[PDB]
Design a binder for this molecule. Structure first.
Ligand SMILES: [Cl-]
Ligand SMILES: [Cl-]
Lengths: 404, 404
């Protein structure tokens, strides 16, 4: 019944350590991609990544961070930023059964799972493992590690859905508001960056391998010579809030979440059907009586995926397609964190009135023809934006956000 | 404002490879716990587990199983059973936008995360890793590995929340029905059994270590001499269905889900709070006009955890305790699979009119004074049942199920 608005955001990304830095990078078309000695050293073919360039040392209390893997660190810092941005005091949001947290990762912590197993296999066994690995390694680490220190009393769990993870978190947070169960839900995600997980993607041929000598050019969504995604890590968090509760406190409102699509392909494991995506966008658009001014695509820089989505975009919009850009060409693919980060990039475009460029397009793919792939930063007043997240395993999420 | 019912179930557990074996084990008070040479060989102090005693070879299509860790296999088989049980034709549930899947795991696949890094570090590098590790290892593996082969078109994602995982999966399925978004949601979870994960629990001292010589006595929820939980693996699935839809097709209805609590402790990371559990049970009982006849407790056989739950149950029910038993004393703790397996034990009790026994109690904990802990199989006409899932990391779920 109830309407859901976004009233604060926070982010730790390859393109910036807070919303000010991210906004600057988006406007500049600045790449967050760097060469990775770690990835090269591990024997991988992809030697490039979207790393967080924040030194996180000392930023979280000792007794809190001892439970945390990097996904949780990134998500925690993002949540601290979001609470500050929202203007929420602990009096208001802590020990409050109407305030929840839904935040996940795509992978958990392969680094800590592998650490556990390596230590256990040495001469010291359990003593080498130590008593902290479960919270770091479990799939719910990002929710568990944040709900305790922020004193959350409402919903507390992690949704995971690969590349759609934190979009489904945001949509479920919206569902909690619509059901009348929560006044606020912090929604987002985090993802560590590590050879332990990255090598799994390289093994399936998913990562870019031909551009290691020019890291900033490797991620190139829609380019005719794209060769796979560039893996990234980071975090993000948004404050999803019931509309009346927000107005009553004088909240700063970014946008209303006016649409949330969530579908399944029920077809292929590793490649999109397009059919799932068409349904997901239409669901997100249902009852949305204003056109989409800007679409932040899923667009990971993969030969098949990039154009399946564009095909889906055509079928949905017909002869009224929106301006489109793929911010992953700058940021890389942060997996479980992508949905919330890209919702944030879309909210920054909406708030500050511009479209970020789809960079590194030297030759546009023929299946992009007739669509407005925006390749230069363009100032424009936007009203309604859409953001797609199409995960491995055929799971789809689309969010539509609109000025109030 | 739509109502949700369970119309089918499926289960692979330490106490039965199907609901008949499960029902029989429940009535008999039969332990599923065995000695594990794998655990011992790994260097652990805990050498007991709730293993799935089922040779799964050739049970799943070669091109479907190749994407799967054990959690997915167990969930897949459970979902096959649940579909048969619900009387669902391929034409009824497949390729249908109003039919979804919400199913998760506590840990994903520690074994395949570790396998990936091990393979990467050896002589074949990426070729050893192979192209199937992401779908085995990622947090959403269980939902991804099932949505494709079962041709699911509606919602598709995983929830993780440790011990509460598949209970939140079921609650979220209910929400999908309440919002009018889905007609059927398959809801459940799976968990592999492996030293790779088990040793992390042992390293924090959570697992039973004193009863290795008598495996069946190890899991002893509420017993004065309990000394930790017994890890288990397995799977479960329920068919969550909108009331009218179920009636319209002449479905067999086990029960209505009349309450669903989901709360967070927001307190001490390590210990269960007590209060979060009180708030969770009260949330699940809100508006329910009938007494709780039977409560399947969370109780994992840990010194602190068991007493916190006892104390919470006494706060909620005062001097009017329901009949209570901890089926984990028979089954061990299947982590991500627990919520749905225990919802199923609960539904089988409501269906077959009996209370399963709380086994291995030689001396009842004193914190259990004033409660009705049932330690012998008891025939009784139940109408309303409750199942608690109080997850590591302070994340709570409770489900209340009632005859129509
Ligand atoms: Cl500005
Ligand atoms: Cl019978």
């Amino acid at each position: 019944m109830k309407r859901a608005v976004i009233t604060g955001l926070g982010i730790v990304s390859s393109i910036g350590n807070n919303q000010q830095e991210v906004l600057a990078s988006l406007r500049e078309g600045r790449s967050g991609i760097t060469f990775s000695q770690e990835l090269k050293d591990s024997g991988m073919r992809s030697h490039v990544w979207g790393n967080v360039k924040l030194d996180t040392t000392g930023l979280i209390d000792r007794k809190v961070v001892r439970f945390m893997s990097d996904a949780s660190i990134y998500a925690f810092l993002s949540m601290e930023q979001a609470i500050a941005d929202a203007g929420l005091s602990p009096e208001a949001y802590q020990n409050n059964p109407r305030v929840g947290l839904i935040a996940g990762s795509g992978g958990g912590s392969p680094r800590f799972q592998v650490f556990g197993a390596d230590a256990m296999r040495g001469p010291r066994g359990l003593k080498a493992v130590g008593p902290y690995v479960v919270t770091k390694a479990m799939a719910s680490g990002v929710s568990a590690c944040l709900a305790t220190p922020f004193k959350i009393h409402g919903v507390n769990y992690s949704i995971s859905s690969a590349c759609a993870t934190s979009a489904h978190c945001i949509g479920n947070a919206v569902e909690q508001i619509q059901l009348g169960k929560q006044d606020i839900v912090f929604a987002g995600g985090g993802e560590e960056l590590c050879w332990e997980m990255a090598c799994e993607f390289d093994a399936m041929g998913a990562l870019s391998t031909k551009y290691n000598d020019t890291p900033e050019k490797a991620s190139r969504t829609y380019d005719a010579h794209r060769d796979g995604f560039v893996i990234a890590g980071g975090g993000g968090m948004v404050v999803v809030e019931e509309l009346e509760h927000a107005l009553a406190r004088g909240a700063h409102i970014y946008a209303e979440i006016v649409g949330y699509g969530a579908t399944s392909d029920g077809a292929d494991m590793v490649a999109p059907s397009g059919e799932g995506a068409v349904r997901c966008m239409k669901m997100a658009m249902h009852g949305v009586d204003t056109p989409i001014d800007y679409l932040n695509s899923h667009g990971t820089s993969t030969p098949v995926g990039d154009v399946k989505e564009l095909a889906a975009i055509r079928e949905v919009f017909g002869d009224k397609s929106p301006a489109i850009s793929a911010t992953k060409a700058m940021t890389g693919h942060s997996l479980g964190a992508a949905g919330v980060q890209e919702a944030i990039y879309s909210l920054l475009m909406l708030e500050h009135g511009f479209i970020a460029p789809s960079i590194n397009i030297e030759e546009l793919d023929e299946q992009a023809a007739g669509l407005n792939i925006v390749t230069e930063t363009t100032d424009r007043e936007l009203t309604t934006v859409m953001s797609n997240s199409f995960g491995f395993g055929g799971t789809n999420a689309t969010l539509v956000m609109r000025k109030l």
